[PDB]
Design a protein around this ligand. Structure first.
Ligand code: HEC
Ligand code: HEC
Ligand code: HEC
Ligand code: HEC
Ligand code: HEC
Ligand code: HEC
Ligand code: HEC
Ligand code: HEC
Ligand code: HEC
Ligand code: HEC
Ligand code: HEC
Ligand code: HEC
Ligand code: HEC
Ligand code: HEC
Ligand SMILES: [Ca+2]
Ligand SMILES: [Ca+2]
Lengths: 520, 72, 520, 75
């Protein structure tokens, strides 16, 4: 049984915590619920930590008083098909392998499944750790509660004796690095300096051995990623997001200065040895748009290359942890502003960007976002109970499972079938244009070897490579983004027609150049 | 928002409650969750109640930390 | 009404039958249930048959006393979609036509459906008899009971006046030969010598005119394929299986000498004119693994070519009826040991194997097989009845239809949805790797004409052809095998990554060789 | 066995933290958790049939008891 400690004693040295804890809705929640600090108190001074106290990062630390929210979060949606590769004719990107050739995603890129699995799925995907980590057996793939208790309760490491990234099976890659983990867990929140910069007080950084870092991490999507454990108030903890919104002054809503001011973020910095160490962003309101943007954004979390001179940009560079915080039509400018690209296409040799799940940036400017609707309204709504205390569902899933609460409450003019039909109209149309964009990209890609072999000039090939950058960007945004156009259908339509235009321009350029070589 | 009270001061007069509260699984649950005793503490002695503190009997006093049980 | 005959009179000349019949659970079942032997008894001697008795091979001969088993066998699973071509984007092998080009399966290869249809489906598929046989109309495709009563009650022959294999429609093939029928029916069990070798007493053999043989055959999957009609004990009748297990001493479980000894097979040979003629394999136990391996195996049942010199291997050769009895990683060695391949690829010219439904060989060494689980546990379980006499279901179908009896009885920790999710995790992952294997095989195949036309040497082309053999084997095993990895997920993963590796090696070889030609 | 085992059982969850249901109601609503977990030999219909055999028999004897009470009262 827990025994309370005297918080006044802590507050003597921890004024920032005092100011947060004594004012919010956790004012009565004793420190012992989440910290074991006995030896810390015996050995600390006002500026020196002494013995390090233990801090619980497990989600059970919150489930004791908030069981309903914990249970709704951990539920597994079995209809979210697991380990389903996207580069197949029945999934999101039928021609993904030809289009992404050169990139590590060619090794495996599955559709997302329930949040409980995020850390284990990151560890076991074929592109991440060379196949080093597996579930203990193929049965454990169902065990969401086990994954939440801890990744290492359900996974095995093929070689606990080495810590290098290497292939354990032939068709795997070693794309994982420490930046990835920031969108899977925050177990390392006290062990990682802001942005993953080098820091005397940080055990882990962007340049750490990722296999060693992985072994220290256990829990997915900690409850405190969106809720300050001291004030219980709304926040974000993700460094890259704080950096975009606050350090770079872009605001929570870059396209709306007024909403950015009403629904803003305040950066709070904690020090080690009186030197800035880590930061959080306190939100003005409980704004799930910005909470979910900690992870559902396009980002860099990887090494790459410079557009200017092609030189390598390694994990040690700040750009290896970056939120572009730009919609699809501002993205090229955002990548140029940091002089960065992801990979060279294996067939065309074009410098290309790699896009990843840009739901937040796509949602900006859409009809729903403009009307003040937020992610949680459709994906984690309040529960409706005939007789019960209302709480917010933490299931985070498609509104198809709760259409009454997620759509029909606002759309009184519709039945559930009508609302589903409206969603499917948009997804069907958008998917048709994704498929057509891939057809044209593939047709362009296939002309590159024919053009090289016919003696087409490097000048003409480079012209086609510049077109490839845009054809790729304006297509891949939409296979990366998970709503298949729903979050912003007009923008998806404009972008995908732009992709097709760019590919068609490149096909015409290469076809003509090949024909001229042949005729000469 | 609830503000915690000094339970040790309560216990100077409330030994029976001390022996129950400090040992069980509500040892970290502050009295303010269920009692409003400010004027009581200002006026009581160990032998005179003074102002009668308020005790919450509503089920919401428990539903805050135990929503699943309350809802079922 | 049947009138019994005096079996003692038969036993005077039929000692093997006496020893089987008098001891088993059919000791009280009179011969007249399955034989009309009156004129036989009048004319036979102890060594000469005289008039041939009639033997019933229809399944109704067993349904009279075993209606529950018969009815469960004949049920049609309407959810097993019929006539569904596998070479489509929504089925098992989206790029099958490019990959299999040169082989008769290019003409049609559908997914399997219920066992009642096996003989009719073999007769009507476009690759088998040149389109000679059809259902009487398109309505009859539903009639499982009719097909069981007899193929020729539901089919038509376009030309009863000729018996040659030829095309009746342009896009058909004539791949059928008499060996095929051994996995569709055993109506010919008294008319076919062991292995289909030539024999004075055999009406039919490997070299027979298959159209004439077809017309003599009626019933699918005779009940006596797994149950001796005399002793009622467990057996197999399939010659190729007996040959692998017993003649070649490979055992019922080639990877487990102890299980092979506990769950073994005894070959029993019957003679004609005191010369060996036919054989059965009596099983030590009622082992459905080996019963189902009569048909659900990789096999040769066709002519082919020698790896050594490329010469034709015809139906007259023993190798045209062959069970390899080898898992995917032992298969290349098994084909080399008989010096055999199936076809030359139409585009690459590579000698290639053709793989077919290797469920038995894939199941070996899997977690379930190692724990003593057998096909019937998941595909024909005991019925569960609140109040009833238990019998074994003969429906032979996916466990999805009976998860309580086929999975959940062993997996108490799971709900039906959890068990389905576990299956789908494996099938989704395996299918993703099949699709990726096909992408790389197709990329390699497309380089062959480009390489030939660029003047790439035969030496380099032959190097790529050797790689094609392996890339093909390690992919096709898994489109052929029906569980999409479920029966052995780790082996599927290792094999498919091997396929991709082999194709990638060949792509790099050909791309470099083409580039060098162009540069010269 | 105690009242809670049949009338306020532990909740069964595929993935979740277990708690005790406080919905103190007939086991007919939750037969998996309030009956069949202990009676593996039965389906839900069989367990319901066993309950109804007792209730029907008992109710018939209640009605007969009332018939005889009423006959006495009327005298
Ligand atoms: C002054 C004598 C202190 C008292 C009393 C307590 N703590 Fe402390 N703590 C102190 C220092 C100088 C530091 C280093 C950070 C800083 O502010 O300079 C800390 C650090 C912590 C941490 C962070 C530990 C980590 O892993 O990074 C926690 C969780 C913490 N302290 C908790 C804590 C509690 C709960 C206390 C009362 C029981 C407490 N501290 C007393 C200085 C002092
Ligand atoms: C019991 C000892 C608690 C533990 C452990 C945690 N929380 Fe809590 N929380 C608790 C109470 C009594 C309240 C107030 C309830 C009320 O509505 O009056 C809360 C409140 C929250 C809130 C809402 C805050 C707000 O709206 O301003 C959140 C988001 C919250 N709590 C989250 C939370 C998390 C993430 C925890 C683990 C780190 C956690 N709480 C622990 C009681 C208890
Ligand atoms: C980083 C810590 C994340 C935050 C914050 C949010 N999400 Fe998320 N989400 C994340 C990952 C890594 C995954 C895939 C997990 C896996 O194992 O595959 C997801 C998944 C979703 C899904 C799909 C769920 C399903 O049933 O398939 C949805 C609908 C989703 N995420 C929505 C969402 C919303 C609305 C958020 C703010 C409340 C949110 N997520 C936060 C990573 C992270
Ligand atoms: C936050 C900005 C992220 C970083 C950094 C990484 N990932 Fe991620 N991941 C993120 C979200 C919001 C989702 C769900 C939405 C989606 O489109 O997938 C994911 C999902 C995964 C998955 C499951 C799906 C899949 O691709 O197979 C894996 C295996 C995964 N993520 C791995 C991964 C790796 C290896 C990373 C560093 C290179 C990485 N993620 C970074 C959010 C974020
Ligand atoms: C961001 C992706 C979140 C994570 C991770 C967690 N919660 Fe949450 N929570 C979130 C939102 C958007 C809201 C609603 C805010 C609003 O007012 O609209 C909530 C709410 C809570 C509350 C308040 C009571 C309620 O509304 O249900 C509690 C007590 C709470 N959340 C607890 C909780 C716990 C225990 C978590 C880990 C399992 C958890 N939250 C994660 C957003 C996010
Ligand atoms: C209602 C107006 C929505 C708001 C606001 C947000 N999303 Fe959404 N999302 C919506 C729909 C109708 C769909 C398609 C779901 C389907 O079943 O067809 C989606 C999809 C997602 C997904 C993929 C979910 C899945 O396929 O299982 C994710 C990860 C997702 N959305 C995230 C997300 C975030 C982070 C949002 C705020 C920025 C957001 N959505 C807003 C409906 C709505
Ligand atoms: C949050 C501030 C709480 C309030 C208000 C109430 N309870 Fe509580 N309770 C709380 C915690 C953190 C725990 C321990 C959880 C754990 O298992 O570690 C409890 C425990 C209980 C129990 C279980 C006790 C036991 O098993 O020994 C019961 C029966 C319980 N609580 C009941 C209860 C009632 C009836 C309340 C209103 C008067 C109540 N609790 C308030 C947190 C909080
Ligand atoms: C009635 C006259 C029968 C005909 C015709 C067939 N069988 Fe039979 N069978 C019969 C009886 C009375 C029994 C014994 C039942 C018992 O359990 O005591 C059987 C048994 C079988 C068995 C089980 C054998 C064993 O477990 O050892 C099988 C597999 C069986 N019978 C199969 C079978 C087949 C395939 C038939 C047609 C060729 C057939 N039986 C005919 C009664 C009768
Ligand atoms: C040769 C005589 C066979 C034996 C012995 C077994 N099977 Fe079979 N099976 C066979 C064929 C030719 C077919 C396809 C029939 C058609 O017309 O397409 C099949 C089909 C199956 C299926 C799929 C059924 C469906 O619903 O689609 C299953 C699950 C199956 N077979 C399993 C199986 C098992 C477990 C066996 C041993 C008890 C078994 N079969 C024997 C050929 C033959
Ligand atoms: C036993 C070793 C077999 C021989 C010899 C032949 N077939 Fe077959 N066939 C067999 C099984 C176990 C199945 C079901 C599993 C599957 O993957 O299909 C089949 C199925 C068929 C089908 C239906 C499916 C299809 O391919 O369209 C047909 C039309 C079929 N088989 C025809 C066929 C021909 C023409 C054969 C000789 C060349 C032949 N089969 C041999 C088992 C066996
Ligand atoms: C092999 C592919 C089989 C064919 C063809 C038939 N049956 Fe079968 N039968 C099979 C197995 C694996 C079993 C269970 C053996 C065990 O003990 O586990 C059976 C069982 C029988 C029995 C016994 C009673 C029972 O268990 O139901 C009978 C009477 C029986 N089978 C009859 C039967 C008939 C009439 C068939 C043709 C319609 C038939 N079997 C085909 C395997 C195979
Ligand atoms: C349970 C542990 C199984 C054992 C033992 C065997 N198989 Fe199986 N099989 C299993 C599953 C879960 C699946 C996928 C079914 C689905 O609906 O997803 C299969 C598939 C088959 C098929 C194809 C069935 C179809 O698609 O309709 C066949 C022909 C099949 N399996 C045959 C088979 C044989 C011959 C076995 C013993 C060697 C065997 N299976 C074992 C589960 C299990
Ligand atoms: C399972 C073995 C039981 C135990 C232990 C207890 N009761 Fe029960 N009760 C049980 C059944 C099967 C029924 C009939 C319900 C039906 O739907 O037919 C009951 C009935 C009640 C009722 C009336 C419920 C209603 O009609 O809605 C009450 C008030 C009730 N039981 C209370 C009760 C108490 C207080 C117990 C412990 C002393 C108790 N029951 C034990 C099954 C079981
Ligand atoms: C008696 C009629 C009860 C009333 C009134 C309430 N609860 Fe209860 N509670 C009861 C039992 C029999 C049990 C299980 C004890 C066991 O270990 O078997 C419980 C349990 C709790 C718990 C512990 C966690 C759990 O098992 O769910 C808590 C937190 C709890 N109960 C809270 C609770 C609240 C908030 C109530 C008022 C709405 C409540 N209980 C009423 C019996 C009784
Ligand atoms: Ca990116
Ligand atoms: Ca073969």
């Amino acid at each position: 049984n827990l025994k309370p400690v005297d918080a006044m004693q802590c507050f003597d040295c921890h004024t920032q915590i005092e100011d947060m804890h004594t004012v919010g809705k956790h004012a009565t929640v004793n420190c012992v619920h989440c910290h074991d600090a006995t030896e810390h108190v015996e050995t600390a001074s006002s500026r020196r930590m002494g013995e390090r106290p233990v801090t619980r990062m497990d989600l059970e630390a919150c489930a004791t008083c908030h069981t309903a929210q914990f249970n709704s979060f951990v539920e597994v949606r079995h209809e979210s098909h697991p380990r389903l590769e996207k580069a197949t004719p029945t999934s999101r990107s039928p021609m993904f392998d030809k289009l992404i050739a050169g990139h590590g995603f060619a090794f495996e890129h599955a559709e997302p499944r329930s949040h409980a699995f995020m850390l284990v799925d990151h560890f076991v995907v074929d592109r991440a750790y060379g196949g080093r980590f597996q579930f203990k057996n193929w049965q454990k793939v169902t065990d969401g509660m086990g994954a939440v208790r801890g990744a290492w309760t359900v996974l095995t490491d093929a070689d606990p004796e080495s810590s290098d990234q290497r292939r354990f099976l032939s068709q795997t890659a070693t794309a994982a690095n420490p930046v990835c983990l920031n969108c899977k867990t925050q177990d390392h929140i006290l062990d990682w300096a802001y942005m993953g910069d080098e820091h005397e007080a940080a055990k882990w950084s962007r340049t750490s051995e990722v296999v060693e870092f992985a072994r220290d991490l256990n829990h997915p999507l900690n409850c405190f990623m969106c809720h300050d454990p001291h004030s219980a108030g709304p926040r974000v903890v993700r460094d890259g997001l704080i950096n975009a919104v606050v350090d770079r002054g872009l605001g929570t809503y870059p396209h709306d200065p007024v909403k950015s001011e009403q629904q803003g973020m305040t950066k709070v910095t904690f020090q080690r040895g009186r030197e800035d160490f880590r930061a959080i962003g306190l939100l003005d309101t409980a704004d799930s748009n910005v909470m979910c943007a900690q992870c559902h954004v396009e980002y860099n979390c990887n090494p790459g290359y410079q557009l200017s001179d092609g030189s390598r940009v390694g994990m040690d560079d700040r750009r290896a942890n970056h939120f572009f915080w730009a919609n699809v039509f501002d993205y090229k400018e955002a990548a140029q502003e940091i002089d960065f690209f992801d990979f060279r296409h294996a067939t065309t040799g074009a410098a290309l960007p790699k896009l990843q799940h840009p739901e937040a940036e796509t949602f900006w400017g859409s009809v729903h976002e403009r009307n003040g609707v937020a992610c949680a309204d459709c994906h984690m709504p309040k529960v409706q109970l005939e007789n019960g205390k209302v709480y917010t569902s933490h299931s985070q899933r498609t509104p198809r499972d709760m259409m009454g609460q997620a759509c029909l409450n606002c759309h009184a003019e519709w039945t559930e079938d009508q609302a589903l039909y409206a969603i499917d109209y948009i997804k069907n149309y958008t998917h048709g244009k994704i498929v057509k964009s891939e057809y044209w990209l593939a047709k362009m890609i296939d002309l590159f070897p024919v053009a090289k072999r016919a003696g087409v000039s490097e000048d003409v090939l480079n012209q086609a490579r510049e077109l490839h950058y845009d054809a790729h960007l304006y297509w891949e945004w939409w296979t990366a983004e998970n709503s298949v156009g729903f979050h912003n259908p007009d923008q998806a339509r404009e972008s995908l027609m732009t992709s097709i235009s760019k590919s068609k321009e490149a096909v015409s350029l290469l076809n003509d150049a090949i024909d001229a070589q042949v005729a000469s």
